[PDB]
């Protein structure tokens, strides 16, 4: 079967922790892909870009392949990871897995009004990777995702139906484009808004409450 | 250039870790021992392995050697530990600065009083 | 060619233009 290592990773094979949202809540370092494989199985894999990269070798010319992959479902979670193998499809494989280790909570939100089931974004968030900076702004309903198809696709699996975008830096280099686009939503929860001002008791670790269900042989 | 390669020292490594009992220092016993325990496709290799894992043993008895632990030494340290005869206080009072004393009276009371000066 | 000698070429040549143009006055 699976055979997990990683106390965090064991505790979910037994049915202790039902969802990812508590892994986040305690800022838990997911070290295994099966954890989030089984935690949220409805993920989709999307290969975005593949470009070859070439090292000059003391004897040889090494041309490997770099793949970029965005994963996520429709709700509040997206992975992004970049894997480079010596063959192509193998790089996508180990990419989707590394993209899975990456996945992150995404706080959607209400544009101007409460009404139904949030669509747009909490605030204005700007991610920056390399030269590329990527700005997300709240939009009304039906505005949709306004952005290039490559960042749009990551904002789909992100689960956002409405966001405005401005792009800065050299956006033709995709790695830093998405890497900054991913950091924008990856920052959505770093914004302390007044509805989140409320005091909360600080729950305690599923690695502790289940401590015996965890550990070793 | 007589030097054992890694396939020889890795064998010798993993052998003594699990097989330290049996495995007497004498080569010819260990060599023959190897055939019944580890599978090796060469006459020479087996002898090369043996002769080295021999060496590991011969020194091990003079104390540990890095990279190998069979766990027998680990708690042999635990029970080998002891020998404190004389801990401290004698014969006299606590020797302490002007200032270290000034700390005592601040937070507490009972200490024996000896204070000398310092400079340079 | 070296920017300084290119600089000196341009100056040599331009002191030649005043000459040839002075003859026109």
């Amino acid at each position: 079967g699976w055979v997990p290592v990683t106390k965090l990773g064991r505790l979910v094979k037994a049915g202790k922790i039902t969802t990812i949202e508590e892994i986040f809540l305690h800022s838990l370092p997911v070290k295994e892909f099966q954890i989030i494989d089984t935690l949220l199985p409805g993920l989709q894999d999307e290969v975005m870009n593949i470009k070859p990269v070439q090292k000059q070798t003391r004897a040889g010319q090494r041309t490997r392949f770099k793949a970029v992959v965005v994963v996520g479902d429709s709700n509040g979670h997206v992975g992004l990871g970049i894997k480079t193998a010596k063959e192509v499809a193998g790089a996508i494989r180990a990419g989707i897995i590394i993209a899975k280790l990456s996945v992150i909570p995404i706080r959607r939100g209400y544009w101007g009004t409460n009404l139904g089931q949030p669509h747009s974004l909490a605030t204005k968030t700007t991610g920056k990777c390399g030269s590329v900076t990527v700005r997300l702004i709240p939009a009304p309903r039906g505005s949709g995702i306004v952005a290039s198809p490559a960042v749009k696709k990551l904002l789909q699996l992100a689960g956002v139906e409405d966001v405005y975008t401005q792009s800065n830096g050299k956006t033709r280099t995709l790695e830093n484009t998405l890497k900054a686009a991913f950091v924008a939503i990856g920052n959505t929860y770093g914004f302390l808004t007044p509805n989140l001002w409320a005091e909360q008791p600080l729950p305690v670790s599923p690695l502790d409450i289940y401590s015996d269900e965890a550990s070793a042989q | 250039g007589r030097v054992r390669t890694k396939t020889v020292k890795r064998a010798s490594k993993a052998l003594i870790e699990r097989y330290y009992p049996k495995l007497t220092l004498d080569f010819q016993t260990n060599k023959r021992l190897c055939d019944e325990i580890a599978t090796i496709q060469s006459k020479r290799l087996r002898n090369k392995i043996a002769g080295y894992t021999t060496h590991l043993m011969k020194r091990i008895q003079k104390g540990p050697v890095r990279g190998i632990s069979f766990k027998l030494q680990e708690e042999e340290r635990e029970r080998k530990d002891q020998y404190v005869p004389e801990v401290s206080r004698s014969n006299g009072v606590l020797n302490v600065d002007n200032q270290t004393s000034d700390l005592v009276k601040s937070l507490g009371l009972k200490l024996p009083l000896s204070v000398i000066n310092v400079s340079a | 060619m070296r920017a300084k000698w290119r600089k000196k070429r341009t100056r040599r040549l331009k002191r030649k233009r005043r000459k040839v143009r002075a003859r026109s006055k």
Binding site: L25, S27, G186, L202 | - | -
Partner: protein, 87 residues
Amino acid sequence: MENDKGQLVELYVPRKCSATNRIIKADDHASVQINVAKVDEEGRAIPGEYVTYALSGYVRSRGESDDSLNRLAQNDGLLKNVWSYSR
């Protein structure tokens, strides 16, 4: 993260650094949660009964995690002497 009428939506109300009152998000891996055990009469420490704190990644990296908890615990009752609020 409420809605039109009533119901609380948007999964995962995040923690906060107790020291700086900063949201501690999923990827902050220098963030830390301290579990301090509340003992009882005759010093026994009552397993499973906790005074806990969360410390942001930022505070630990700056070197302020020490002096932060010292402030945070003493005014919570776990110490006296040591830290001076004034300097």
